[PDB]
Amino acid sequence: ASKAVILAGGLGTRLSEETIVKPKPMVEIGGKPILWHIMKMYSVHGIKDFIICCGYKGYVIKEYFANYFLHMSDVTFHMAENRMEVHHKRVEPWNVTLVDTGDSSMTGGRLKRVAEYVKDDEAFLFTYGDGVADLDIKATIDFHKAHGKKATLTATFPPGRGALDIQAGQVRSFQKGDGAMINGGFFVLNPSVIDLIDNDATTWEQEPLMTLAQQGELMAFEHPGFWQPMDTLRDKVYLEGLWEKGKAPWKTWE
Amino acid sequence: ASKAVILAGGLGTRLSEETIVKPKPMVEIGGKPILWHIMKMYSVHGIKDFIICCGYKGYVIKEYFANYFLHMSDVTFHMAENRMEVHHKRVEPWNVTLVDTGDSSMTGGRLKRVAEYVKDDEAFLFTYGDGVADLDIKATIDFHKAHGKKATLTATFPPGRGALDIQAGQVRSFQKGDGAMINGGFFVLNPSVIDLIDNDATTWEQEPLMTLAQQGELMAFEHPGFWQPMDTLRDKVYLEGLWEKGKAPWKTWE
Amino acid sequence: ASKAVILAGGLGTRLSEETIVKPKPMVEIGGKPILWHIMKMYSVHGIKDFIICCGYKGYVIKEYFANYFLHMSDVTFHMAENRMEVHHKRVEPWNVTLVDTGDSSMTGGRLKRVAEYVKDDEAFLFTYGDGVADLDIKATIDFHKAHGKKATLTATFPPGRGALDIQAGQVRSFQKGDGAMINGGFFVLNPSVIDLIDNDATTWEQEPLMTLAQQGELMAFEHPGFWQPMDTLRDKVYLEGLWEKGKAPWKTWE
Amino acid sequence: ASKAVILAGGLGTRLSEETIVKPKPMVEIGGKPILWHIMKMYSVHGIKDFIICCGYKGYVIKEYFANYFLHMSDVTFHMAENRMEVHHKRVEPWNVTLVDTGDSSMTGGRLKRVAEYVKDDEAFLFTYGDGVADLDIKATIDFHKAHGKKATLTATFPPGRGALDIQAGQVRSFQKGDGAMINGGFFVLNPSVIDLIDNDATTWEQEPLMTLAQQGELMAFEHPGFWQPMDTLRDKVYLEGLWEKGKAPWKTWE
Amino acid sequence: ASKAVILAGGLGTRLSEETIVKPKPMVEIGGKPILWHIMKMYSVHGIKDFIICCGYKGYVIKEYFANYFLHMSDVTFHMAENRMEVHHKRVEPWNVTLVDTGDSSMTGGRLKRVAEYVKDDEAFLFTYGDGVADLDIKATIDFHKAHGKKATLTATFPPGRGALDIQAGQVRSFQKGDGAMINGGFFVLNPSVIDLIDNDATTWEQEPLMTLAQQGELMAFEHPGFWQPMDTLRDKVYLEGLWEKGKAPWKTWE
Amino acid sequence: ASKAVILAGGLGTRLSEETIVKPKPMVEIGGKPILWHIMKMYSVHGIKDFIICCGYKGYVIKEYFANYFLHMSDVTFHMAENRMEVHHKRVEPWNVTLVDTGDSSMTGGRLKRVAEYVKDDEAFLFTYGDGVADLDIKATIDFHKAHGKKATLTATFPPGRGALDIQAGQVRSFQKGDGAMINGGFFVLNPSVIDLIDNDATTWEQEPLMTLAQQGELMAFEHPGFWQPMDTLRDKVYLEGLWEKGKAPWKTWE
Numbered sequence A, B, C, D, E, F: 001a002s003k004a005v006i007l008a009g010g011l012g013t014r015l016s017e018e019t020i021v022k023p024k025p026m027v028e029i030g031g032k033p034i035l036w037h038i039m040k041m042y043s044v045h046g047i048k049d050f051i052i053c054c055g056y057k058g059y060v061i062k063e064y065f066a067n068y069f070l071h072m073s074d075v076t077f078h079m080a081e082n083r084m085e086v087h088h089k090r091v092e093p094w095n096v097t098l099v100d101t102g103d104s105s106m107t108g109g110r111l112k113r114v115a116e117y118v119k120d121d122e123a124f125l126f127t128y129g130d131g132v133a134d135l136d137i138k139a140t141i142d143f144h145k146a147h148g149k150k151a152t153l154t155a156t157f158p159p160g161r162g163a164l165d166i167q168a169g170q171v172r173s174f175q176k177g178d179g180a181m182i183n184g185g186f187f188v189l190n191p192s193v194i195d196l197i198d199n200d201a202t203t204w205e206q207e208p209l210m211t212l213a214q215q216g217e218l219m220a221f222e223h224p225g226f227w228q229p230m231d232t233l234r235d236k237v238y239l240e241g242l243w244e245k246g247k248a249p250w251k252t253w254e
C-alpha cells in the first residue's frame, strides 16, 4: 500500500464564493490548496504516489502541479533576458497522476475510473479532497492489515455547530460521546472493492460502502483527534485562523 | 406559564438568499413564515401569548401580523367600490407583542430586553425563531415544574450532514447515540434567570446558560423525536419538501 | 364570457434581477406592474372581472390591490392628525380575485385550481401574466364564438433576437413569414377544457393544449400586430423604452 | 420659507446592497430611514412641511408614511379580536407630500416637477435625501434673506478617504483647508430659480446651479461642522456606528 | 479558401455566470471550449488555419492553445525530478493565430482588423464563436463558388423558446416554416467585403451585411439541420446534455 | 536609488467586480494591468528594478511575468508541430522580484518584509499598486536628495466626486485650493525608515508615516498634475476612457 486516491471532482456548491473560480480542493489554507495539505499528510506517512480524480475545473490542478515551484516560491524575472529565477525550488518526492474522472461522475463512478492505477495493489488509500486531520495514516494501514477485511474507514468526531453533558436529566456542561462518530473519509481499501461500483453515477457512500458494512467487510478506524473538513467559508476561515496562529494540528510535517 | 419569548433579531447570514429581503424567521414553509409554525407549536400546547424580539428587519413581522388575514386567505377586491373581501378570516386566539430588541443585541441582551413581559411569571418559555419539532411543550413545562430549577432546555438530536454504528471496530451500519444530544432551544425558564444577562451584548448561550449549568440550575428535557432548524437553503427545501408530502412532524395541529 | 384568468405563479428565474423581490408580473412598465397593463388590455375590451392564480410571492399582488390608490396617486400625510390624503383616487370598474394556486403548481394545475370561478361560464379568457399586445380581445372572443370549438389561442409572431428575406438563395433583406407564428397566450376557452388538466403538476402547454389540437378542438386566432412578453431584463427595458417614448402599442386606453 | 423639497428619486447604484430592495433614502440609521433624519433636521429648525420627489421605488416611502406609527413603535396584536395596539403613537407636526417625479428625471427635472408646491413661496428649501449634518438651517435661511439673491447652497467640507498639513514642503501632520469646500446640498432657494430648469432631463448641478453662480446669483453658506452623505455601505456603517455610540452630531433634537 | 476567422471578443453579458471568469467561447461543452468544437467543425471540412479575433479576456485563449496538450490529456508529474508527462499528446494539424482585435471593437471592426490574414485569399470563412451545427461547410464553400458573389451566409432555423402548425385557422400541432430562417453566421466571404467595414465601431450585421444584401451581393446558404448557439446558461446545459447522451449533431468527427 | 517597492497585497474589496478573480493591481487599463502602467512610469524615469509585495492572489502576478511576452503580443501556434510563435517579443530592461509578503500583512508589515532588498540602498522608492500619474519621479528623487530627510511623499490633489470657488460668501464657480492636498503614495525613502515598522500588522500610514511627520522627518513633494487611483469600477472606466481617447496623462512613454 503506497498509493492514495483523492477526489477532487465536486461542484463545491456550498463554497461558491471561491469555487466559482476553482475546484474546492484547490482552495487554500496558508496560501496552499487544501489538497496539498492532505497530500502532505500522506507523505508524512510514507504515501508519495497519488492519483487525483479531477472533474469540475480540473485544469486548475493540472496547472497547479505544472507550475508548482512557482506556486511555491518567491521569484525574480530578468525580463531583459527573458529569464525566470525561482528563489526556492522545493522538491516533493511525489508522483502525481491527474485523472479526468468525468464532469458528472459521482464518488463511486470516479474511483471506479482509476482502477488500473491500484488494481495490482495489495491495498490503496482513498479519501476526500475536503478534509484534514492529525490522522495517523500508517496506523490505519496496519489496522486494515491486522483485520484483513476489504475496507477500512476512519471514524471521527464531527465538528459541532451545541453538544451537551447530560447526566440524570441535568445539563452538566456545554462541550460527541460514544456512538457519536462519523465517516471522515480516509479509507484503506481493497482493489476488490471497486467491483461494488456500478458506474459513474455511483455515490460511493451508498452501495459500495453500505454493502461493505452489511457484508461484514467494513471496519472502522477510530480517530479521537483533530479532523476538519471544508465545505463552507467559515470552514476555511477557521482553518485559516488555526494556521495563522501556528495551530494546524493536521500539520504533521516540516 | 403561558408566555413564549421568540428570538427573531438575527442577520440570517447563512440564508441571505432569502434574508436579504426579510428576517430569517419570516421565511416560509408551506407559504407560512417559520415563526408562525413555531407559534402554532405553542398554541397546540396552550401557549397563545407571545413576545417577539425583533431586530434585523422587524417591520416585516410587524406587517405580517398587521395584515395576517390577508396573508392567510384568498381575497376579492371590489375596486369599483374600493372594497376588500377576504375569503377566509381565520382567528388566532393569540396575543402578540412585537418588540424591537435592538439592531445589535445578542440573545441574552434581547431576552433581557423583554423582562417586564414575563417578570411576574411563574415561568415562561423561550426559544429560537429557527427551529421546529414535534415537541411536547406541555411535558417540558411540567418537567420544569417537577424539577423546580430555574431553567430547562430541550436536548435534542441533531440532523447529520455521516453517523455510524460501530461495534468492536466494525461498522455495522450507516445511520447520534448516547451522549450525543444538543441544545435545540425550547427553554422553560425562571424570570430569575434574566439576572444572568449582563447587557444587549449578551449571548445567552454563554454565561447565562453556562453559569446555569455550572450552577446546577440547568436541566435538560430529552427529545428523541423530530427537530429541525433552518439556517440554510437546504434547510428550507427539506422542510418545504417534508411539508408538501404531508410530512411535517412538527405539524401537531388542525 | 366576461372573466379573465391570469397566471402569476411562476418563479421568474430568467428575471431574478427583479423577481428576487417580487413575482415577475408585479414587475413594472411605466411604474405599473405588467399585470396591470394586461388587465388594462382586458378592460379596454370589456373584461373587468379577473382571477389571479397566485403562487410564488403572491402577497405582493395582494398588497398591490389592497393599496391600489396609494400605488396609483400622489399623496399627502397630515401626520400631526394621522391623516392620509391620496391626491388621486382612480376607480377601476373591476373585480379581482386573487387565488393561491399553490407554490409548486404548473400552468394546468393552477388553472384547474380556479375552475369554480368559471365553471358556469359560457366561456372565459386565459393568458399569461408576462405578455402585452395591441390584441383585439373582443375579436378573439367572437371568433371563438363563431367557431364554437372548446379552445382558441392567439397565434402571434415572435420577437426575433436575425430574420431574413430569401428568394432564390439570395438574401434580399434583414427583417417571421408564414408558418412562423407562435402561441402568445390570450386564450379563449371552454370550461369543459379543464377536464384535460390532471393535477397541479399539469403544464397546460402539454396535454391539455396538445390534446385539444390533436382533438381538432384547437383554434388559432392570428395576430399580426404588436405582441411582447417579458422574461428578461432586456424585455423590460425595451417595454420601458417603448412606454417612455409614448410608444406602447399595447396601450389601447385612456 | 417653510417648505423643504427633498430628492429621493435616484437609483442608488453605489449602494445596491440595500437599494435593490428600497430607495436609498429609505435606508436606515438607527432603525430610521435617512430621510427621516433629514426631516428631523428640518423640523428642529421649524420646517415641518415637506415635499418628496419620489422616483425609483417610491411606494416604499409611501408605505413608510402610510404606516409610520407602526414603523415607529412597539405593538400588540389581539388577533383573536383582530385588534392592533401600537404602544407608541408619536406625532409629527408635519405635512408630507410624496410626489412621483418620474422614473427617469434628473435633479432639475424633478424639482421643476414640484413647482406649484413652492411657487408663491417667499423661498423654499431644497436638498438631497443622502446627507446629514448639524447644520443650522435657520441661520442659512436668514443668510439667504440677508443677501436677497435667488440661491443659497451650503458649502461644506468633505469627508476624506489622506489630507495633509504642509508648510514649506514639510508634512507637519496627517488631518480640507481653505478653498477646499464643497456643495453639501442644503439649498435655500427662490421659486424664480425653477425657470432655469429646462426639463426632466435636467441635472440641477449643471445649468441651473452653474448659471446661478455665473449669474452672480449664487451664494454660499459656509458650514465647518459635521456633514456626511451616504452613497455606500461604509457610509452607512459609519453613520450607524456614530449613532450607536450616542454620537450623531446631526442629531439636533429630542 | 482555407482560412476561418472566428470572433471571440464579446463581453458575454448574457452568460456572466461563466463569462466573469473567461471569454464566452472559452466556455465548454464536454470539457472542451465551444471554440474548439467549432474549429473541429472546420477541420472536419478541411479548414485547419484559423484566426481568432480576441478582445474581452483574450489571454484565456492564448493560454488555452499555449497548454493545449495539458488541457487535453491526463498527466503525471514526477515532481521529485520536476518532470511532466502528458498521457496523451494529441496533435491538431492546425495553425492558430490569436489576434487582439481590441477591447471595444465590434464585429465589423474586428474582422476589418485581421484583413492581411485573408487579403490575398480567393475567399475565407467567417463565423461566430457561439454557434455549433452539423453544417456542411464544404458545401457552403462550393456554393459560394458556384454563385461567385462576394458573400455567402448560412441561413438557419432558429431554436424556439412555441411554434405552430396552423391551417385554416386551426392549430394542427405544436412544433419555423418557410420564410422563417435566420442568419446563423457561417459566412463564406470575399476579402473585398472588408471595404464595407468603416472602423472598429462596425457591427458587421449592419452596413456591411445590409449593404451586401442591398447590393445583390448577399447569398444565403440554407441549412435545415442542427444549429445551436450559446448565449445563456440554458444554452450550455442543453448542449452539455446533448453531448453527454452521445447526441451532438454538430459532432462530425472522430 | 534605483529600486521601487510596490504594494500589491490588498483584498480589493471595493472592486470585487474584478478582484474576485485577481489582485486589484492586476486589473487592466488598455489591456494592461495597472501595475504595469506604474512600472512603466518608473522605467520612464530610470527605475527598472522592482520588488512586488504580493499577498492576496499573488500567483496572478507571478504568472503575469512568467508569460509576459504572451500577455503582450499576438501569436501563432503551429500545433501540428507543437510550436508557439509570439509575434512580438518586447523586452523590458527590468528586473522583477515578486515577494509573498503574507496574506494578512498590512502596508508597513509588507514593506518591512522586503527590507533586505533595499537595505544597502542610498534610498528606494515606495508606492501603491493602485495609482497612476504624470509624476516626475526623478524630480521627486532629487528633492528627497536635496532635503536629505528620511522620507518624501508625494502630495497630490485628489479627484473630487463638488469643489467650489467661494469668495466673500459668493460662489464664483464649480471646479482643491491650497491646504487641500493628499498623500498620493509615490514615496522616496530611507531604508532607515523600516525601523519604524513594528510588524506585519503595520499600516504604514499610521506610525511609521505619522511618526516621520512628527519627527520632522517627513517631506512633501507637491504634484499639481494628473494623479488618479483605482479603487472602484468607475475608477477603472474613467481610466479606461482616458486611455481609449489617447488621453492617459500618466502615459509618459513610447
Ligand SMILES: Nc1ccn([C@@H]2O[C@H](COP(=O)(O)OP(=O)(O)OP(=O)(O)O)[C@@H](O)[C@H]2O)c(=O)n1
Pocket (backbone or CB within 6 Å): A006, A007, A008, A009, A010, A011, A012, A013, A014, A015, A024, A025, A053, A055, A104, A105, A106, A107, A110, A128, A129, A130, A230, A231
Ligand atoms: N461528484 C462528485 C462529488 C464529490 N467529489 C469530491 O468529493 C469530495 C467531497 O465532496 P463535498 O465537498 O462534500 O461536495 P462538493 O462536490 O465538493 O461540493 P458541494 O458543497 O456542492 O456539496 C471533494 O473532494 C469533491 O471534490 C467528486 O470528485 N465528485
Ligand SMILES: Nc1ccn([C@@H]2O[C@H](COP(=O)(O)OP(=O)(O)OP(=O)(O)O)[C@@H](O)[C@H]2O)c(=O)n1
Pocket (backbone or CB within 6 Å): B006, B007, B008, B009, B010, B011, B012, B013, B014, B015, B024, B025, B053, B055, B104, B105, B106, B107, B110, B128, B129, B130, B230, B231
Ligand atoms: N443577535 C441575535 C442573534 C440571533 N437572534 C435570533 O436567534 C435565532 C437563532 O439564530 P441563528 O439562526 O443561529 O443566527 P442568525 O442571526 O439567525 O443568522 P446567521 O446565519 O447569520 O447565523 C433566530 O431566531 C435569530 O433571529 C437574534 O434575535 N439576535
Ligand SMILES: Nc1ccn([C@@H]2O[C@H](COP(=O)(O)OP(=O)(O)OP(=O)(O)O)[C@@H](O)[C@H]2O)c(=O)n1
Pocket (backbone or CB within 6 Å): C006, C007, C008, C009, C010, C011, C012, C013, C014, C015, C024, C025, C053, C055, C104, C105, C106, C107, C110, C128, C129, C130, C230, C231
Ligand atoms: N408554475 C408556473 C409557471 C408559470 N406561471 C405563470 O405563467 C406565466 C409565464 O411563465 P414564464 O414567464 O414563461 O416563466 P416564469 O415562471 O414566470 O419564470 P422563468 O423565467 O423561470 O421561466 C407567468 O405569468 C407565470 O407567473 C405560473 O403561474 N406557474
Ligand SMILES: Nc1ccn([C@@H]2O[C@H](COP(=O)(O)OP(=O)(O)OP(=O)(O)O)[C@@H](O)[C@H]2O)c(=O)n1
Pocket (backbone or CB within 6 Å): D006, D007, D008, D009, D010, D011, D012, D013, D014, D015, D024, D025, D053, D055, D104, D105, D106, D107, D110, D128, D129, D130, D230, D231
Ligand atoms: N435622477 C435622480 C438622481 C438623484 N436623485 C436624488 O438625489 C440624491 C443624491 O443622489 P446620489 O446619491 O448622489 O445618487 P443616487 O441616484 O442616489 O445613486 P448612485 O449611487 O447610483 O449615484 C438622492 O436623494 C437621490 O434620491 C433623484 O431624485 N433623481
Ligand SMILES: Nc1ccn([C@@H]2O[C@H](COP(=O)(O)OP(=O)(O)OP(=O)(O)O)[C@@H](O)[C@H]2O)c(=O)n1
Pocket (backbone or CB within 6 Å): E006, E007, E008, E009, E010, E011, E012, E013, E014, E015, E024, E025, E053, E055, E104, E105, E106, E107, E110, E128, E129, E130, E230, E231
Ligand atoms: N464586439 C464584439 C461582439 C461580439 N463578438 C463575438 O461575436 C460572437 C457573438 O456575439 P454574442 O454572443 O451574440 O454577444 P456577446 O458579446 O458574446 O455577449 P452578450 O451576451 O453580452 O451579447 C461571439 O463569438 C463574440 O465573442 C466580438 O468578438 N466582439
Ligand SMILES: Nc1ccn([C@@H]2O[C@H](COP(=O)(O)OP(=O)(O)OP(=O)(O)O)[C@@H](O)[C@H]2O)c(=O)n1
Pocket (backbone or CB within 6 Å): F006, F007, F008, F009, F010, F011, F012, F013, F014, F015, F024, F025, F053, F055, F104, F105, F106, F107, F110, F128, F129, F130, F230, F231
Ligand atoms: N494589507 C494590505 C493593504 C493594501 N495593500 C496594497 O496597498 C495598495 C492600496 O490599497 P487600497 O486599494 O486602498 O486597498 P485594497 O486592499 O487594495 O482593497 P480595498 O478596496 O478593500 O480597500 C494596493 O496596491 C494594495 O494591493 C497591500 O499590499 N496590503
Ligand SMILES: [Mg+2]
Pocket (backbone or CB within 6 Å): A010
Ligand atoms: Mg457533495
Ligand SMILES: [Mg+2]
Pocket (backbone or CB within 6 Å): A130, A229, A230, A231
Ligand atoms: Mg464535504
Ligand SMILES: [Mg+2]
Pocket (backbone or CB within 6 Å): B010
Ligand atoms: Mg447566529
Ligand SMILES: [Mg+2]
Pocket (backbone or CB within 6 Å): B130, B229, B230, B231
Ligand atoms: Mg440556528
Ligand SMILES: [Mg+2]
Pocket (backbone or CB within 6 Å): C010
Ligand atoms: Mg416558465
Ligand SMILES: [Mg+2]
Pocket (backbone or CB within 6 Å): C130, C229, C230, C231
Ligand atoms: Mg414567458
Ligand SMILES: [Mg+2]
Pocket (backbone or CB within 6 Å): D010
Ligand atoms: Mg447620482
Ligand SMILES: [Mg+2]
Pocket (backbone or CB within 6 Å): D130, D229, D230, D231
Ligand atoms: Mg450623493
Ligand SMILES: [Mg+2]
Pocket (backbone or CB within 6 Å): E010
Ligand atoms: Mg452581442
Ligand SMILES: [Mg+2]
Pocket (backbone or CB within 6 Å): E130, E229, E230, E231
Ligand atoms: Mg450570439
